[PDB]
Amino acid sequence: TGLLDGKRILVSGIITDSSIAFHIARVAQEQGAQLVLTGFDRLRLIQRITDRLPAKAPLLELDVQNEEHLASLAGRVTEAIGAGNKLDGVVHSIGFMPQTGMGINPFFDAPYADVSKGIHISAYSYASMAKALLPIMNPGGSIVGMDFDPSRAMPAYNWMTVAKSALESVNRFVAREAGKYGVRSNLVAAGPIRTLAMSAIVGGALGEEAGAQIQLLEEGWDQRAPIGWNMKDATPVAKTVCALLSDWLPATTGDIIYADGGAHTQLL
């Protein structure tokens, strides 16, 4: 027992109890992992949420757009897990795109300054995070990031889709670098999940305009999924991420694992 028994995994991206990163952390601990969490901006509020996990764990601040945060990351993580110890896993569950580039706003009306910001946080940070943490990762390690299949365009997602396409490409290169440390790098392309952020997006940025398309688009996942899809349950996704963090997918890297009920393999 204990899928991640005796493993040191840094999990990023927790902002609310609905965050995918929160469920990844939970299942991870339930499987015997010692976690190190990173938060952005409102650390106090994050701490409130994190304290609801199965076990306690170090919470460090990390704004992936801040050079010093990334420059001190390794040292700060080492102080947290104790000198002489290294990380066995890294979870990147960070994403962002201003309303201008994701929602009801026209595709052609997104200022690059906004798009660039979204790509910085959603894609480039996967590499900067890898750079800061690879030096303190043990062989057999695993870096995992969250993705949303951008192989085909769709309503509303717009520039966040572009950001995910960049992410998938960044992951392939991070895998080359990571390989030098005996570490694997992969993405988990999850089906739609009703996280607070997602729920806000779905509605708070479309009203009754795109609300239709997004409703249909959304309903399509469960229809297409041979084993169905429950947008209100992040657990299957969290389990998939822990699977990549374990030693049971030792020959897979620079890849993408789809945790979407099999929806992307079906047309109707």
Ligand SMILES: NC(=O)c1ccc[n+]([C@@H]2O[C@H](COP(=O)([O-])OP(=O)(O)OC[C@H]3O[C@@H](n4cnc5c(N)ncnc54)[C@H](O)[C@@H]3O)[C@@H](O)[C@H]2O)c1
């Ligand atoms: N919600 C979905 O249906 C869905 C589907 C597929 C993939 N994903 C991906 O999963 C990840 C998390 O999704 P979520 O719905 O749980 O989102 P939210 O927590 O619920 O997660 C986004 C995280 O981004 C963090 N963040 C934003 N800017 C940051 C910065 N500069 N530095 C550090 N952190 C920053 C936030 O603080 C937050 O914790 C994202 O990469 C997202 O694109 C989500």
Ligand SMILES: Cc1ccc(C(=O)N2CCC(Cc3ccccc3)CC2)cc1
């Ligand atoms: C902070 C943050 C977190 C996660 C995302 C992220 O991955 N998006 C969220 C809304 C999703 C909406 C949906 C589109 C099609 C069908 C069903 C639902 C699309 C993907 C962006 C920003």
